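Predict the holo structure. Ligand: magnesium ion.
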Amino acid sequence: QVTVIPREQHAISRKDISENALKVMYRLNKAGYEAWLVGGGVRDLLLGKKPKDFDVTTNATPEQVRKLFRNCRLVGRRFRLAHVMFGPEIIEVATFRGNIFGSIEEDAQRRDFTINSLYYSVADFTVRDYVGGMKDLKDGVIRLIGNPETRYREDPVRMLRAVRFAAKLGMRISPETAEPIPRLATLLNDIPPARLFEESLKLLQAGYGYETYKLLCEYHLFQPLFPTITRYFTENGDSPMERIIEQVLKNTDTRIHNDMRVNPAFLFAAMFWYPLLETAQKIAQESGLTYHDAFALAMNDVLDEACRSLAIPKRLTTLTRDIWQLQLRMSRRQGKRAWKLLEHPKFRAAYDLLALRAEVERNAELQRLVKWWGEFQVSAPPDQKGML
Amino acid sequence: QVTVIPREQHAISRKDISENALKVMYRLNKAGYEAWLVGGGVRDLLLGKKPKDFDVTTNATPEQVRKLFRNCRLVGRRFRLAHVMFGPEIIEVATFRGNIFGSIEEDAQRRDFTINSLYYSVADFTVRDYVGGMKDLKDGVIRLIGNPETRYREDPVRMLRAVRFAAKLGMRISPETAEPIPRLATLLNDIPPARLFEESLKLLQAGYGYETYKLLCEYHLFQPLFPTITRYFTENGDSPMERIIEQVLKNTDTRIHNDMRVNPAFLFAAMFWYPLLETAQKIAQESGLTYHDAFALAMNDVLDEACRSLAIPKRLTTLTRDIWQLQLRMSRRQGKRAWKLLEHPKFRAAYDLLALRAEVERNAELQRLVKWWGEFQVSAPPDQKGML
Ligand SMILES: [Mg+2]
Ligand SMILES: [Mg+2]
């Protein structure tokens, strides 16, 4: 009913707050086609927040669009979606969708959620709401577009996004859009591990991982992704592993909010720590082997388990292992062979994993290794001498 | 004299300590060529220690050493002196010198010091002492070769080497080999700037820099190199700049010896600190403007006149700029920018410069900033937050 809403009444998504990606819409409008702003920004802008990306949408063949920007630095590849560069600014320019494409209204339906589907045009300063969009955005409601049941089945990932946005923005998930999940959760295991990875970092790294974890668990959507971990929760609720994941997420959340670059390998080596430590002690007694070699074995075990669900890059995995290895050495009350560690490119991680280990296990013996490497890592060579 | 010494009369020097340049010498010997092991390690082997390098000399022309090795990996270039590469152990094979190329007695002549001219042949397990070498190396005396006065004028840098070895091994410089230095020192500003740099680092950044600095001051060899510094020495003997330098050395020494790695950008940024700080006081209290901007000129000046003597690469200077910059940033008690700062690459250095600035000045309003940044960088995010 309320399809087109004008500048004065829409929380002024004030023209001037649009990264000059207007210069790209202009070349479109000034070229016969029409161009719009969708999801990402238009959502945030209308809310109030500082948008985190501007995505334009046009009705120009992904072909015509390629022609109109020969002078421009457009990073090709990939169908429908055309890319354009400036500085630390890249502009997504996707053609509508629907023989394939068609109206701006046809496109508004293939999109996932309501709020993420509001259109803005700089030409008339109006925003088109061909979905609950506006109302939902107002009430703080994440609502899936078509028939939940059907869409989820078509692309199970949508279940994850539905919960992610729900935790990222501070709103509740739509009723008819929430029911299906607990059931269909299982449906993710049919997804390339390559992807469940990509989409997993967008959940926990991204800066809202604590809340997003509170949800991914309360919708059994955590199960499919992290079996190796699910397995160890204690109905109790205070397992030291459980605490570790909660904290490491609150902390990784702080970092991302205070702009501090973060480690993806750290995250995993933190979550999978106790389960690793468990499979370590298990193979120890069940095969009377030496601890250092039992643990060294367990690493391979836990990884190809997780790796089975989340395709983790061989890159990140190497580090992880190291972040763990150091958890051994760093305890052995070492001597003049410690400088060697203080130097490891991973000492920082390893340390911060020991910061936590001592924090959650409220173990005084461990918390000593930390108060020690605490001094020894910031000390100066003279004192660092004596210390050893 | 005693020209040749047998393996039964010369310190261990058992062929089994000669890593495997042996395979480079054998290939020559099998070809009707002379293989002598000369220089550093050949000296050390006698003392007992372990050779840090293995170089070899032969009566084979450089274009001959090329044929008999066209197979192996020759990191060629460099007239004379061919480069054989095993990998983490590269061997140098250089041709005898003189009309151009000559014999072993001829080569032993154009060689700087005594102990650095003993030859060894796997062929007959004998060391060749054409120069004083043996005696010198026993008594522990750094004696030059020909006529001190003329060789120093030939290549002034030779004097720097004189102290360098004098410091490294625990030996004394020969009387005749010393007399000229105080007088001839000034001959160093007639030496390319970039070249001094090499030889400057070869002195301090070599893990002997404390003993080598003292010997550079006692022979007035320091002055020609770091004019910008000499200028602020105080008659009283131990100012704050005069402690800062002895410490940065004693420490950069400690590191190198406990096989750590070391930042040169740091070494300098430390020495030249107070001087910069001095050009700040004047540039400020005169032509009076803001301490920040004043301090910004103080940098360009110091580096300019300092880089007039030493040729510090644009690279190194830029990191020096940083370490200094951070000394103010870190100064002002504050936060939220803190993380944005803790993430700075040259932060590790900056901290350690404050480490010293506090030690030397004994000022408890700095040792205070240290006890802070010290704790703010070892504790995890929950505390790192409350500390602001
Ligand atoms: Mg982007
Ligand atoms: Mg060398």
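Strands of chain B lie at 4-6, 36-38, 55-58, 82-87, 89-95, 119-121, 126-128, 141-142, 172-173. The domain at 141-388 of chain B is CATH 1.10.3090.10 (cca-adding enzyme, domain 2).
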